[PDB]
Amino acid sequence: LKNQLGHLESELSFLSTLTGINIRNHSKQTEDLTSTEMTEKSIRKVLQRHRLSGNCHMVTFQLEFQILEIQNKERLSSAVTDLNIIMEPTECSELSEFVSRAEERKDLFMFFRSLHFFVEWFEYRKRTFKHLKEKYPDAVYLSEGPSSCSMGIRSASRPGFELVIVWRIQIDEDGKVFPKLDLLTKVPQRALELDKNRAIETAPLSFRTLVGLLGIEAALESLIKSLCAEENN
Amino acid sequence: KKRQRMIEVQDELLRLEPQLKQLQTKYDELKERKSSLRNAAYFLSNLKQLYQ
Amino acid sequence: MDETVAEFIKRTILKIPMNELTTILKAWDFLSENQLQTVNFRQRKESVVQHLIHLCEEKRASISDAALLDIIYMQFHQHQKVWEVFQMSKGPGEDVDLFDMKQFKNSFKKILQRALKNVTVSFRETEENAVWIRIAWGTQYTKPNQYKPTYVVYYSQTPYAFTSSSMLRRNTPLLGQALTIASKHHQIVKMDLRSRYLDSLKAIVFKQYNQTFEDSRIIHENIVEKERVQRITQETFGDYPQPQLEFAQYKLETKFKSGLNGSILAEREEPLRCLIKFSSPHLLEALKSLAPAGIADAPLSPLLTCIPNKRMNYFKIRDK
Amino acid sequence: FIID
Amino acid sequence: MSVLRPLDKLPGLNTATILLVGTEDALLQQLADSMLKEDCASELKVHLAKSLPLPSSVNRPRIDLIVFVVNLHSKYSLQNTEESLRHVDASFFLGKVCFLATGAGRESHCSIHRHTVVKLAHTYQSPLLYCDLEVEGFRATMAQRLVRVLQICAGHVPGVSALNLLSLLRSSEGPS
Amino acid sequence: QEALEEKLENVKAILQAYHFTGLSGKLTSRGVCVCISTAFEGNLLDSYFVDLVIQKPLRIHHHSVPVFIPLEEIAAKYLQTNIQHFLFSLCEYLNAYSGRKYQADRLQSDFAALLTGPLQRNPLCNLLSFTYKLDPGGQSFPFCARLLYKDLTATLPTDVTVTCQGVEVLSTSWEEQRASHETLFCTKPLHQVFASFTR
């Protein structure tokens, strides 16, 4: 029984790296809802309440759902009746609107595959902002750290020219998770008459064409490096 | 010999469909690539001359 | 009423036995059920030919109604004809396809009435949306080939098709490209695999039927030999149910080279041409019993084990 | 053993 | 090493054995099961072999009898037997090697000559017997016949030795 | 022994819950076999098993997924550079595949008495066609709706073309009705808009 547990823990170690979800504790509860009316082809009602206390790669979750199973001799169906999400305050605050949508839609399989895709773009963000901070420590400053809502670049000796980059995550009803890269500029009114080519009006639309052609990280490193290296003064 | 003529032009009809279909999409991509690269070279030159 | 299409009505009564004669006529569902119990099925078989020909006269059957009976007769009897496979290819620059059954039945009808002037086209829709197509080939003058039909099995979403071997081989590029245009594809490849069981050829290709899981006085001294000759057959074949293939032609152009003889074909540079056919039923679980019999080697050759995997049986072998 |  | 000798170790106390050498695994198993039906006063230990030379096992007893079950419908049982009698000693051939040619009842589908196994036994000085093991009535006559050879080769009777079995099982054509 | 059997049932409660999260599977000598369970609007069904090898390169042996969707071009692209992205894409393909089959079973069970004429269904359900009748003011209106899909990874429609088989020379009620069906087919699923038709 130490050897029969020893290959099941390898199956727990394989599915924690495959599905990305480690379940810490689980409870099993059986309640019976068998009706007391006599009829032909009698239906056994199986109500199973489960508590899923597990975590993702960085965030945790808590589930409370019951499933009413319909056992009948002609057809086989089972309906998920009640959903409940017990949430904690985390380092992201834009995923709370999906909590109210999943409670109305009552599809917990949409809740499991989209929040792992939410961390899959967020673990890309932890590898990108580690690269952007340690390479340029004097120009790229992050206000809430790498778990922020937006990032900006600020020059050291030039305190008036800034460029902020907002990276939001929106989830539609098609089951996909898509980012949205938008640019906002911080230029005061003294350089408005010094610019006559009007590139600051068409500045977010030219920034999204660098995303679809060069990439996400290749567009972010092009706005940091080409803004620099003016070493005449 | 006309049914053998009809079956080979129809064989040449399916021989000529997909490679001008995929080079229509590659012409649509390369026109989208050049119009994005010229608008980004106009954008990056105007932002460095704003920086000077 | 034409006589030559009425000969095909009395032929299919003669080609069915009397035990499954009630199975075909209830699935044919054109006659009402009060006339089926009126005709006595326990009498002589030539009276069944005479009684059913009055029922086909007063209900005014046509050439599509008599070919509707031919599909149901060949659905429950799939053993008389072989089935070659066709492989259609998806073109580049495509992500999704547009298929419609009303768009399929007119585009396949107009592609055969344009090429030849006498082509009989009949359709039947079955379970899980499979279209069953009869083609009767007429050349330029005669009413078409009624005694020798040609069947096309198409499952309405797959690029794989099960077409029977016709006796007119000159219309076989015409039948292949006509399925290619009406199903929105651009390339037809005749893949070389054939058998007499249509239910086993949909099990070996579609791969949805192959796996169904969720005293010390008689002691051997061959401990290292006994479970070595069966461990290869369990990790490749196993005791699981397998599809049926009864034919495999092996075209060998290989040479002869061995370490035992030093004067037998030691100067030959010419290839030794061969062709090896297998003619035995259920061959995939017939070759697994030779390895515990001791008449075959426990490193079995991969040419006999890639037959459900590589999805053909015609192989061409090159060796020095 | 290749198959052409 | 991988050699065979009939005299290296101790036999035991009223315990003999038999080395069934053959290629068929279902045909020699029914011969091995039928020898345990006919009871005797000795413990029988049936060994099943594929082809000589055997692997080097250390839990083997002294071997009293090696039979070579060849098939008359198979050349694979003959070509393995020709490789089997190369790694043997000459002290096996003093009345301790018997032959069995199976398939002698069917003279319509036979695949090797009857004179070939006579010439194989004449130059090697071994007795040759014919039996068909497909019949259960013929197999019990065969399973009786393996016991009374094994009573001679183990030395369970007084006065009859292993080379006395070779002199009784001689075969020679008439000189006239 | 009671400490190990308590820890054995704690593994058995988590491995029961791995079927409830969508993807479960045990290890095999012949690779790994992963069962994928799909659901739509709180109603689940049977699972489909996909066998995947461990050895290099990654080859496919067998799958209980039907071949109505092409699995060859997906496994040449998504299986090569990633492992968990290929399994979570096919969990979204089969939920879109069982999401279209859930709407076809409901249409032939309860709301088949409202439709007239035969139905023509493809197993991919990329193009649907059905003709129904409603009574908004006491007159039967035969409405023929064709539902074409533009995104293969979704459940909701994109291309909605609703025509009328009967008369069309009337007031502005049917033009307001045809504008009402095109908005309630794009932003509402098909089982909830049939229950609104009885309302």
From Swiss-Prot, chain A:
Protein name: Centromere protein P
Keyword Nuclease in annotation: no
Family statement: Belongs to the CENP-P/CTF19 family.
Keyword Nucleus set for record: yes
Keywords assigned by UniProt, alphabetized: Centromere, Chromosome, Coiled coil, Nucleus, Phosphoprotein
Chief location category: nucleus
Role this protein plays: Component of the CENPA-CAD (nucleosome distal) complex, a complex recruited to centromeres which is involved in assembly of kinetochore proteins, mitotic progression and chromosome segregation. May be involved in incorporation of newly synthesized CENPA into centromeres via its interaction with the CENPA-NAC complex.
GO CC annotation, single: nucleolus
Record's subcellular location: Nucleus; Chromosome, Centromere
Subunit organization: Component of the CENPA-CAD complex, composed of CENPI, CENPK, CENPL, CENPO, CENPP, CENPQ, CENPR and CENPS. The CENPA-CAD complex interacts with the CENPA-NAC complex, at least composed of CENPA, CENPC, CENPH, CENPM, CENPN, CENPT and CENPU.
Listed GO biological process terms: CENP-A containing chromatin assembly; chromosome segregation
Gene assigned in the entry: CENPP
Organism, scientific name: Homo sapiens (Human)
Species classification: Eukaryota, Metazoa, Chordata, Craniata, Vertebrata
Range within the parent protein: 56 to 288 of 288
Curated annotation (Swiss-Prot), chain B:
Tissue: Expressed at high levels in the testis, fetal liver, thymus, bone marrow and at lower levels in the lymph nodes, placenta, colon and spleen. Present in all cell lines examined, including B-cells, T-cells, epithelial cells and fibroblast cells. Expressed at high levels in glioblastoma cell lines.
Subcellular location per the Swiss-Prot or TrEMBL entry: Cytoplasm; Nucleus; Chromosome, Centromere, Kinetochore
Coiled coil: 1-42
Family: Belongs to the CENP-U/AME1 family.
Oligomeric form and interacting partners: Component of the CENPA-NAC complex, at least composed of CENPA, CENPC, CENPH, CENPM, CENPN, CENPT and CENPU. The CENPA-NAC complex interacts with the CENPA-CAD complex, composed of CENPI, CENPK, CENPL, CENPO, CENPP, CENPQ, CENPR and CENPS. Interacts with MLF1. Interacts with PLK1.
UniProt-recorded name of the protein: Centromere protein U
From Swiss-Prot, chain D:
Shown stretch of the complete protein: 303 to 306 of 943
Record localization: Nucleus; Chromosome, Centromere, Kinetochore; Chromosome, Centromere
Subunit structure: Oligomer. Component of the CENPA-NAC complex, at least composed of CENPA, CENPC, CENPH, CENPM, CENPN, CENPT and CENPU. The CENPA-NAC complex interacts with the CENPA-CAD complex, composed of CENPI, CENPK, CENPL, CENPO, CENPP, CENPQ, CENPR and CENPS. Binds to DAXX. Interacts with DNMT3B. Interacts directly with CENPA. Identified in a centromere complex containing histones H2A, H2B and H4, and at least CENPA, CENPB, CENPC, CENPT, CENPN, HJURP, SUPT16H, SSRP1 and RSF1. Interacts with MEIKIN.
Cystine residue pairs: none
Function (record text): Component of the CENPA-NAC (nucleosome-associated) complex, a complex that plays a central role in assembly of kinetochore proteins, mitotic progression and chromosome segregation. The CENPA-NAC complex recruits the CENPA-CAD (nucleosome distal) complex and may be involved in incorporation of newly synthesized CENPA into centromeres. CENPC recruits DNA methylation and DNMT3B to both centromeric and pericentromeric satellite repeats and regulates the histone code in these regions.
Organism: Homo sapiens (Human)
Protein family according to the UniProt entry: Belongs to the CENP-C/MIF2 family.
Coiled-coil regions listed in the entry: none
Protein name: Centromere protein C
Curated annotation (Swiss-Prot), chain F:
Compartment(s) where it occurs, according to its Swiss-Prot or TrEMBL record: Nucleus; Chromosome, Centromere; Chromosome, Centromere, Kinetochore
Predominant subcellular localization, coarse grouping: nucleus
Keywords from the UniProt entry: Centromere, Chromosome, Coiled coil, Kinetochore, Nucleus, Phosphoprotein
A GO biological-process term: chromosome segregation
Keyword Coiled coil: yes
Cellular component, GO annotation: cytosol; inner kinetochore; Mis6-Sim4 complex; nuclear body; nucleoplasm; nucleus
Parts forming coiled coils: 1-19
Keyword Coiled coil tagged: yes
Entry function: Component of the CENPA-CAD (nucleosome distal) complex, a complex recruited to centromeres which is involved in assembly of kinetochore proteins, mitotic progression and chromosome segregation. May be involved in incorporation of newly synthesized CENPA into centromeres via its interaction with the CENPA-NAC complex. Modulates the kinetochore-bound levels of NDC80 complex.
Assembly and binders: Component of the CENPA-CAD complex, composed of CENPI, CENPK, CENPL, CENPO, CENPP, CENPQ, CENPR and CENPS. The CENPA-CAD complex interacts with the CENPA-NAC complex, at least composed of CENPA, CENPC, CENPH, CENPM, CENPN, CENPT and CENPU.
Recorded family membership: Belongs to the CENP-O/MCM21 family.
Protein's name in the database: Centromere protein O
Source organism of the structure: Homo sapiens
Lineage: Eukaryota, Metazoa, Chordata, Craniata, Vertebrata
Gene coding for it: CENPO
Full-protein residues shown: 91 to 289 of 300
